[PDB]
Structure formats: structure tokens, C-alpha cells
Amino acid sequence: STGSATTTPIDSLDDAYITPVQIGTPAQTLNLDFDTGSSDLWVFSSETTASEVDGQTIYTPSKSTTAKLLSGATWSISYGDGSSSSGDVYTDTVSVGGLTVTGQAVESAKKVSSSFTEDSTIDGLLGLAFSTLNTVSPTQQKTFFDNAKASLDSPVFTADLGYHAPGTYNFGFIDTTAYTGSITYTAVSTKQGFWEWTSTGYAVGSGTFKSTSIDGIADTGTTLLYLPATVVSAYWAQVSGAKSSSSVGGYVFPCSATLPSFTFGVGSARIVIPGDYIDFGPISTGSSSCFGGIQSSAGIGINIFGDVALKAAFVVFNGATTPTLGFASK
């Protein structure tokens, strides 16, 4: 089997992407944030504290003839941005882009933190990291991809995120029309539960390529590119007036600037992020200070190849017995 679904930016900055997901019988379609940095499929629901729902579409398990309470199971998750959610668990039928999994754990939120409430466009998350990170207790549950894998034509999914435009998540096949050149594959460590890999270096604009190993994660659920402070300083030093602002929370730059590109290495291959992809717009409405799309990871503990980086590539998440990542230009 295969599936193919369009993923759409939630706003004009590509802050996140939403993909429609069918849950239950008859189908209830919710727009979920596909997140290769976590491993829980959770949704706003009829159980979510009413004051914490503000415009999201909810899953109502009592209206699904295939929903079953997973008795005794609870979940609770905290994300790198400080947001969180928790609740109980149902199993139900879940379909993405024509690919159907029966018995998928659908984690129903009883509580969500304010950033989720405040984002009316995201009805929940669909985790695509390794199932060892799933938070369901006392019986850990599998991701949608893990449950689908054995049925797929090939044990892969691909992320093809658009810049200010829709893109595609495919399951079970690699669309050879969706990229240019060849796909370069690179090793993955699953030791932390992430799609963790090592970039071979970087370049700023037209500058020379610096060969240096940068371990980090391919994370569709993180907006920006978070890299070591040395690398990030070298980038922003090429932008007149750019500076790190403790009060804003990262590098800002004059909105009048033209940003240089940023290249990252995948083996001997190179992925070029155009300068425009690094512009996240005014820090507040009407400001002439703009927020940068490349930020330091120094306070995170891990480097994160988020959407800014991934949207410049066609990315293969290869879930074969030894997982690997593939990157192609497009």
C-alpha cells in the first residue's frame, strides 16, 4: 500500500504545516501537524477542557463506531518549545492520504497548554519519530508509520515541504518526479528516538564550504534551523545590522536586508537554503526588526534541522531495519 497527502502552511511564514487525517467511522477529518521529532498522535477532542479549545476541530470518539477506549492508558508530553498536552487513549481507524491503519492509538487530549489553544489551525500532532519516544503509559504505543510499515510497498515516508506553498507527505514510495538529481543517503542514530544524523558542514552565501560534523535531528515539527553558536554567528555576521537580542529571544536583522543563502552538507552533497527562507518577518506587527530563521541551539542540547532546512530538500525517512535519511535538491 501507499498514501499521499498534501501538507499546507498554517500561515504566511510557514510556522508549521497541517495535513488532513481521517479518524474513525464515519471519518472525522482533523488537520494534524506531522512531527518527525515526536512519537504521539494526539488530538483535540470532546474530552478537551472546554476553555482550552478555541476554533480547533475536535475528535469525538463516541461518534465513531470503530473507537475503543484503551483502558487504563494515559499520555503526557512536553515539547522543546515548552508546550504540553495530556489525556487518555482510544484505538481507532486512521487514514492518511488513502493509507489506512486499524487499531491506531489516538491520544485524546484532556488538557493542552496555551500555545495549542491559541493556534486554531492545528487540531493535534501526528508523531513520526521512533516509537520508543511514545509517551503512552503503561503500554507504550506505536506511531502511525510503525503500524503501517509492514503493509507499505517500501518502508519509507517522504517529506516535501513547500516554501510559502503546499507540499506533500508520501508513505510507502519515493516519487522520482519530486526532486532533481540524486538522493544522498546518510546514517541515522535512533539512540535518542529521533531521526538523528550528521551533516558534513556548511557554507554561508557564496562563501567556501566548511567541512565539520554537525549532529542533529530532522524535525518537521520545528519551524527553524537551530545550529551551534559558532555556525549561527558566522551566518549572521554576513548581514549588516544583524544581532542576537536577549529580549526578543534570538537573532534579529533589519527587515531591509537581503539575506544570504545557507548551505548544509549531506555526505558529499549540498542542500542550499535560499536567503528568503531565513526571513521570519517583523518581530511584532509593523516593526522594522525581522526575526531570523537560523538560530543558536546552544540552549537546546541538540541541533535541529527544522522546516527552514527541510523545505529546501526532498527528504526520505527510510524506516528499513537499519534506518537512514535521504536528501535531494528539488
From Swiss-Prot:
Entry's Gene Ontology molecular function annotations: aspartic-type endopeptidase activity
Disulfide partners: 255-290
Provide the E.C. number(s) assigned to this enzyme: 3.4.23.22
Any idea where the Peptidase A1 domain is?
17-328
Q: Which UniProt keywords apply?
A: Aspartyl protease, Disulfide bond, Hydrolase, Protease, Signal, Zymogen
Entry keyword annotation includes Disulfide bond: yes
Any one GO BP annotation for this protein: proteolysis
Q: Which residues form the active site?
A: 35, 199
Reaction equation(s) it catalyzes = Hydrolysis of proteins with specificity similar to that of pepsin A, prefers hydrophobic residues at P1 and P1', but does not cleave 14-Ala-|-Leu-15 in the B chain of insulin or Z-Glu-Tyr. Clots milk
Q: What class of enzyme is it?
A: hydrolase
Task: Return the similarity comment.
Answer: Belongs to the peptidase A1 family.
Name the UniProt record assigns to this protein: Endothiapepsin
UniProt lists the gene as: EAPA
